[PDB]
Ligand binder design. Structure first.
Ligand code: C2E
Length: 242
């Protein structure tokens, strides 16, 4: 239609919804972690997935505003439990010199505890905008936020990026848990996890949709898992982590 007109209006009328998908600790950590996922609410009140609007938003100069809406609301809902939220950043926000100054004031205004937010950057974006990702993640550390790289492991030399960035969590690409009946894929997954741990990064493995995969990941040493098998995205944070 005019997705752009709809987005412009949505940003001014709270016509978005946050969903939450729990991230589960396998090694005894007590935080109640959730990933925040965004849905646009169309004029009929239906949830529309990021695939249908984030691209057009960025091209129309709206991506930073969408990220600020998500972050502002995450900070709020959080404030309302040892909860930690994983929040996505678009590439536009990576490049935005105003993000850090604004985030600093936004955190203080809600009186948010340290280590409450983890900002997620895709591997592709971390690599494409390496200098900006370096600066942003260093700044996040100064503000006592954490950071993560998601969709990890698909670039030619995925570990090189970590030489430059300040990140505590690494969320590997969902492709790595497909076809785990093949021993080659088991070995690839195990090696990836092992190398992340050598680098003292916490591994998160998503797309867990089966007991065999859950068990394989647990034996491979993954520090956290996520997937429909545990719980899909929901409007409420009521997962039983205990
Ligand atoms: N097959 C399968 N799928 C699963 C499973 N568990 C979760 N998913 C879905 O897999 C996608 C994971 O997010 P992402 O791909 O890393 O990447 C995200 C991220 O790049 C972007 N995104 C979503 N929310 C936000 C947001 O708040 N801000 C920004 N900047 N980007 C967002 O949109 C992408 C897609 O998000 P979603 O449509 O919510 O789609 C999500 C999630 O709903 C599973 O076990 N199996």
């Amino acid at each position: 239609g005019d997705v752009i007109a709809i987005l412009q209006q949505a940003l001014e009328t709270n016509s978005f919804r946050l969903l939450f998908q729990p991230v589960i600790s396998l090694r005894g950590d007590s935080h109640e972690n959730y990933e925040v996922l965004l849905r646009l609410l169309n004029p009929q009140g239906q949830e529309v997935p990021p695939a249908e609007f984030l691209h057009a938003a960025k091209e129309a100069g709206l991506a930073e505003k969408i990220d600020r809406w998500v972050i502002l609301n995450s900070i709020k809902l959080l404030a309302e439990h040892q909860t930690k939220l994983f929040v996505h950043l678009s590439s536009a926000s990576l490049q935005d010199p105003g993000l850090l100054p604004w985030l600093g004031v936004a955190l203080k205004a809600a009186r948010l505890p340290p280590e409450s937010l983890v900002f997620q950057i895709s591997e592709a974006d971390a690599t494409s905008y390496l200098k900006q990702a370096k600066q942003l993640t260093q700044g996040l550390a100064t503000l006592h936020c954490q950071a993560a790289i998601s969709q990890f492991g698909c670039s030619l030399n995925p570990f090189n990026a970590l030489k430059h960035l300040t990140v505590q969590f690494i969320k590997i690409d969902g492709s790595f848990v497909q076809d785990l009946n093949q021993v080659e894929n088991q070995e690839i997954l195990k090696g990836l996890i092992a190398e992340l741990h050598e680098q003292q990064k916490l591994s998160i493995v998503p797309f867990v949709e089966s007991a065999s995969v859950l068990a394989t990941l647990w034996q491979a040493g993954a520090t956290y898992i996520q997937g429909y098998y545990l719980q899909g995205p929901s409007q409420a944070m009521d997962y039983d982590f205990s």
